[PDB]
Amino acid sequence: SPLMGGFGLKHPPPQILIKNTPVPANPSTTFSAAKFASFITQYSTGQVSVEIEWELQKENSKRWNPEIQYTSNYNKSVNVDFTVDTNGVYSEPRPIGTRYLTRNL
Amino acid sequence: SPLMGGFGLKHPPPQILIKNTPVPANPSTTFSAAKFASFITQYSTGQVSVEIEWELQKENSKRWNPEIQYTSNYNKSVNVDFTVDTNGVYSEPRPIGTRYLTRNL
Q: How far apart are CA B15 and CA B7, in angstroms?
A: 16
B65, A83 contact by CB (below 8 A) = yes
Strand-pair partners of B24: B39
Radius of gyration of chain B from Cα atoms?
A: 26
Neighbours of A64 (CB within 10 A): 8
- What is the identity of the amino acid at A19? K
- What is the identity of the amino acid at B96? I
B82, B71 contact by CB (below 8 A) = no
Q: How far apart are CA B63 and CA B38, in angstroms?
A: 70
Q: How far apart are CA A5 and CA A18, in angstroms?
A: 28
Distance from CA of B24 to the nearest CA of A (A): 47
Q: Does B30 touch chain A (CB under 8 A)?
A: no
Experimental method: cryo-EM
Strand-pair partners of B90: B84
Instruction: Please name the residues in contact with B27: beta carbons below 8 A apart, sequence gap of 6 or more.
Output: B36
Give the number of A-B residue pairs with CB atoms closer than 8 Å. 36
Q: Does A77 touch chain B (CB under 8 A)?
A: no
Outline where DSSP puts E strands in chain A.
none
Q: How far apart are CA A76 and CA A55, in angstroms?
A: 36
- Which ranges in A1-105 belong to alpha helices (H)? none
Resolution (Å) of this entry: 2.8
Q: Of B82, B84, B60, which Cα lies nearest the Cα of B71?
A: B82
Distance from CA of A23 to the nearest CA of B (A): 44
Q: How far apart are CA A9 and CA A11, in angstroms?
A: 5
